[PDB]
Amino acid sequence: HHHHTDPMVSKGEELFTGVVPILVELDGDVNGHKFSVSGEGEGDATYGKLTLKFICTTGKLPVPWPTLVTTLVLCFSRYPDHMKQHDFFKSAMPEGYVQERTIFFKDDGNYKTRAEVKFEGDTLVNRIELKGIDFKEDGNILGHKLEYNYNSHNVYIMADKQKNGIKSNFKIRHNIEDGSVQLADHYQQNTPIGDGPVLLPDNHYLSTQSKLSKDPNEKRDHMVLLEFVTAAGITLGMDELYK
């Protein structure tokens, strides 16, 4: 909805009332393997709900789809009404923000990504460049030894006033088919594209849940993604309203 005492919050929340179309474009290069991914779907910030179908437009994806879940739109996260003054992602809109990441896979290579997330008219667009180096050929990544699922996880978000944005470091535990886990340490920084003011948040975390599925009628290498992202970690406003 729109009814917020803060006009800055009302500016951001209004852009994400209801369902918004999403376009995702990634151009990636992992160990010389060049690939491109196009994703389409819709986000519902009211419920923190994402529905996206990604298509590898260059053939077979040289990396497992779970390794690209976080790389392949945080502005659709559901921030509770008492935490909406900490929604950096919606405040940077419609100009958008740059999302840069370095993803270290334990005992394997690393991803280096840079994305520009912004509105193209009514459509929320995520344009991504990916560069992967030093990956082991027979490893869990290029060997496609990971399971096709995603574990739920909480990730803390912290402000970065020197860059007028946010920063985040967190661990992703991919499930290997033999029962083990492939650690993927994420380092993230976000900076607004426009020079206007943004909402610098307090330290809070995002609860994330993802379901991976397949379109039975799709013959191209693809991934169907249902993702829920809800912010938490800030108790009400003053004290408590019930105890």
Documented resolution in Å: 1.7
| Backbone conformation region of residue 153, classed left if phi is above 0, alpha if psi is from -120 to 50, else beta | beta
Q: Bridge-partner residues for 186, per DSSP?
A: 103, 170
Q: Residue 78 has what DSSP assignment?
A: B
Rounded (to 5) percent helix, strand, coil in the chain:
10, 50, 40
Rounded to an integer, what distance in angstroms lies between the CA atom of residue 44 and that of residue 9?
A: 17
In 3D space, the residue among 233, 227, 184, 225 whose CA is nearest the CA of residue 206 turns out to be 233
Question: Does the domain made of 1-243 have the CATH classification 3.50.50.60?
Answer: no
Asked if residue 221 lies in contact with residue 60, where contact means CB atoms within 8 angstroms, the answer is yes
